[PDB]
Design a protein around this ligand. Structure first.
Ligand SMILES: [Zn+2]
Lengths: 172, 286, 289, 48
């Protein structure tokens, strides 16, 4: 599917940065990042907080927060951007989200793509999704597939730098 | 003791930036940072600052975290960039102090013994002076009362060194008022003063009401100081002063009268000169 | 062929300008430098939010001065506080020299441009920018391979001659020949102007203080004496009323003298000082008992 | 019939055609004025 000129940010997801909260041991975070039946479930409650980190500032167009049709798919999704520190569940509900999204049943299907306000996400470095309920009100929710579609923002990697022209030891 | 804590413009413009950095995404209360600056005889100069990762919890009001290594390493960099700055205190934009201030101040006492916390009310833009500077004193309260930590107050004043002054003056360059004042701005300077004196007197009344209704503790000190201000009133009704006031009011009116006359004769002379001008050109047209 | 439309702006935040000016005056006898943190929001706008000083080193303002360990660590630590901006350019002062880039500066700029084709370079003369004027021109190397095409490769736009004209004290050091200026525009916003307005803001107490009458009476007496002598000339200047081409008389005696300029000009001062003083006097009589 | 004519002329088919037939039939633009401007262009952004 995907829109014209935009690519999935799977290659851009920093495995080091990503961390889920309430993820069950049997079905972990890595499961929901693969295009397989393997999924992620929340152990201690239906609330889940799945954060990701991108290698370089990326832009966001459409995330695909797919979920199982058993009713344990996500229902209400709160997205935050460029969080300086990891989030807390109690403080996550309080804080106002960048885009409060009410997933509809049509979205959870395998082919469903949910559109995000492209204006708000222009320099996202780390996005945290907060699943506040599942469709069936089941004890544990599930994210069948979840990835972000946008474009990469060219970032000036000062780590490389390196002189390209000139001779060393030259002053003003 | 620190007679003054002169906050330079750059700090309150980085704190504002610091508040925006976080509040924009991580909606949270006060943003805490470190305040660098050079010492003086007694007036602490605040010349720069930086942010320190600070997270707090409304529960128990002591589950916080002010990073040590970030504070240590940051200053490790800044003393490299500029060596006249030493850590001198902290800043938080939460308008009302917290229960966590004392404990955290003890921490910043580990980096500067005479640590002064400057509360910058970044959100408000009001009567003025968006900085409030506090110290830490532990005294026996002379007058037989429990001991405690408490934050004593230190006079705060906002000033500017030459370099920032040039930047600031241009930075406004669209709302700055004329330095001359002129009659228009001078009078507004007084409607502004009246509004304040009422506003300050109203804060005094509410507190006096609070102590009057018990909701607050009779300080027993600073309470009678307000009684000092209440005796320092002028008592203008005194005859010998009433005469002496009319003399100076009369002494000035004779100068505004002479000023008024000069401006009138000049006015008439300018109309006569102009009446000749258009009339002479009137005849000369023919 | 991409082109930096002259409409393209390097937005300088109210923070950066004070911090960039502060660094420049910090080491004014020598030359200081630091990296600027911002975002390339799009082609026609290079937004710089924060700047962090790169420590002064003996090299000067050159690629070598950019300590990779200092920059990699500082960036890492500013990312935690909530400023995940990218290195958008570099700035260096020019103790009184002007707003131009020397040969060595050009080589630096070419390096920064290597990482992103829009790394803007600024200057910031802390000695000339001493008053309301702030001499800070932004610059981006105009790659020498575009001599076949149009330099300053702009397109549809009309803000090229606005906000500035090519400064002569720079056009000589290589402009529109190797480095072109980019319009500099400051992103001051409310909640930042208000906090800067406190720099010289007075207070509630001010405006009710009655001056002091001893030097006020002396001042009133002083100005009235000076205006008196100015009336004597006003009488002589008018009572002369010499008509030998009076329109020419009014233009051969213009030296900022008697007739009016040293006249009521003082009346405004004399009358403003008294009215404000009197009004303060009566307000205090009402407010304070 | 006539209403079809009415529709044809209210929509603006006719006006443009007649307005087009006018300007094409009565066109007279002094190309000489452009030439002295095209040759006077210093190859600046005045090419637009
Ligand atoms: Zn230079």
């Amino acid at each position: 599917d995907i829109p014209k000129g935009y690519m999935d940010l799977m290659p851009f997801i920093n495995k080091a940065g990503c961390e889920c909260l309430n993820e069950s041991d049997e079905h972990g975070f890595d499961n929901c990042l693969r295009k397989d039946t393997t999924f992620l479930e929340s152990d201690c409650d239906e609330q889940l907080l799945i954060t990701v980190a991108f290698n370089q500032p990326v832009k966001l167009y459409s995330m695909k927060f797919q979920g199982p049709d058993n009713g344990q798919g996500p229902k209400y999704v709160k997205i935050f951007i460029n969080l300086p520190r990891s989030m807390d569940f109690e403080e996550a509900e309080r804080s106002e989200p960048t885009q409060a999204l009410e997933l509809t049943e049509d979205d959870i299907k395998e082919d469903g793509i949910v559109p995000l306000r492209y204006v708000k996400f222009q320099n996202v470095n780390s996005v945290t999704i907060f699943v506040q309920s599942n469709q069936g009100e089941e004890e544990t929710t599930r994210i069948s597939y979840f990835t972000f579609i946008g474009t990469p923002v060219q970032a000036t990697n000062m780590n490389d730098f390196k002189r390209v022209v000139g001779k060393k030891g030259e002053s003003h | 003791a620190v007679q003054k804590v002169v906050v330079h413009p750059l700090v309150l413009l980085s704190v504002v930036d610091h508040f925006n950095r976080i509040g924009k995404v991580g909606n949270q209360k006060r943003v805490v940072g470190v305040l660098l600056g050079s010492w003086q005889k007694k007036v602490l100069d605040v010349s720069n600052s930086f942010a320190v990762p600070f997270d707090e919890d409304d529960k128990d009001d002591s589950v916080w975290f002010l990073d040590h290594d970030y504070l240590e390493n940051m200053y490790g960099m800044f003393k490299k960039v500029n060596a006249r700055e030493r850590i001198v205190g902290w800043y938080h934009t939460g308008p009302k102090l917290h229960k966590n201030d004392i404990a955290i101040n003890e921490l910043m006492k580990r980096y500067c013994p005479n640590s002064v916390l400057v509360i910058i009310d970044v959100k408000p833009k009001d009567l003025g002076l968006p900085t409030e500077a506090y110290i830490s004193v532990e005294e026996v309260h002379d007058d037989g009362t429990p001991t405690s930590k408490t934050f004593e107050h230190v006079t705060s004043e906002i000033g500017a060194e030459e370099a920032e002054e040039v930047g600031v003056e241009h930075l406004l360059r669209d709302i700055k008022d004329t330095t001359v004042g002129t009659l228009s701005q001078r009078i507004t300077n007084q409607v502004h003063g009246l509004k304040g004196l009422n506003s300050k007197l109203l804060d005094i009344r509410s507190y006096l009401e609070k102590v009057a209704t018990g909701k607050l503790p009779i300080n027993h000190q600073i309470i009678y100081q307000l009684q000092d201000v209440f005796n320092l009133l002028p008592d203008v009704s005194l005859q010998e002063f009433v005469k002496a006031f009319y003399l100076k009011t009369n002494d000035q009116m004779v100068v505004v009268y002479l000023a008024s006359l000069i401006r009138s004769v000049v006015a008439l002379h300018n109309l006569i000169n102009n009446k000749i001008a258009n009339r002479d050109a009137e005849k000369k047209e023919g | 062929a991409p082109a930096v439309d002259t409409a393209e702006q390097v937005y300088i935040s109210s923070l950066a300008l004070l911090k960039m000016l502060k660094h420049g005056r910090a080491g004014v006898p020598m030359e200081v430098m630091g990296l600027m943190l911002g975002e390339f929001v799009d082609d026609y706008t290079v937004r710089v939010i924060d700047v962090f000083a790169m420590p002064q080193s003996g090299t000067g303002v050159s690629v070598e001065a950019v300590d990779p360990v200092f920059q990699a660590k500082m960036l890492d630590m500013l990312k935690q506080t909530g400023r995940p901006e990218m290195v958008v350019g570099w700035y260096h002062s020019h103790p009184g020299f002007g707003c131009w880039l020397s040969g060595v500066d050009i080589n630096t700029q070419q390096s920064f441009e290597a990482l992103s084709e829009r790394a803007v370079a600024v200057v910031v003369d802390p000695i000339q920018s001493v008053k309301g004027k702030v001499v800070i021109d932004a610059f981006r190397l105009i790659n020498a391979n575009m001599m076949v095409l149009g330099h300053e490769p702009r397109q549809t736009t009309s803000n090229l001659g606005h906000l500035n004209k090519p400064s002569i004290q720079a056009l000589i050091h290589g402009l529109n020949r190797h480095y072109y200026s980019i319009t500099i525009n400051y992103r001051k916003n409310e909640l930042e102007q208000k906090m800067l307005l406190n720099l010289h803001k007075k207070s509630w107490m001010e405006g009710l203080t009655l001056q002091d009458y001893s030097e006020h009476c002396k001042h009133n007496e002083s100005v009235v004496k000076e205006m008196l002598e100015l009336a004597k000339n006003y009488n002589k200047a008018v009572e002369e009323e010499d008509k030998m081409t009076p329109e020419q008389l009014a233009i051969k005696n213009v030296g900022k003298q008697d007739p009016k300029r040293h006249l009521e000009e003082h009346v405004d001062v004399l009358m403003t000082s008294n009215i404000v003083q009197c009004l303060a006097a009566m307000l205090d009589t009402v407010v304070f008992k | 019939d006539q209403t079809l004519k009415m529709i044809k002329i209210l929509s603006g088919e006719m006006a443009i055609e007649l307005h087009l037939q006018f300007l094409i039939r009565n066109n007279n633009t002094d190309l000489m004025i452009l030439k002295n401007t095209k040759d006077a262009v210093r190859n600046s952004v005045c090419h637009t």
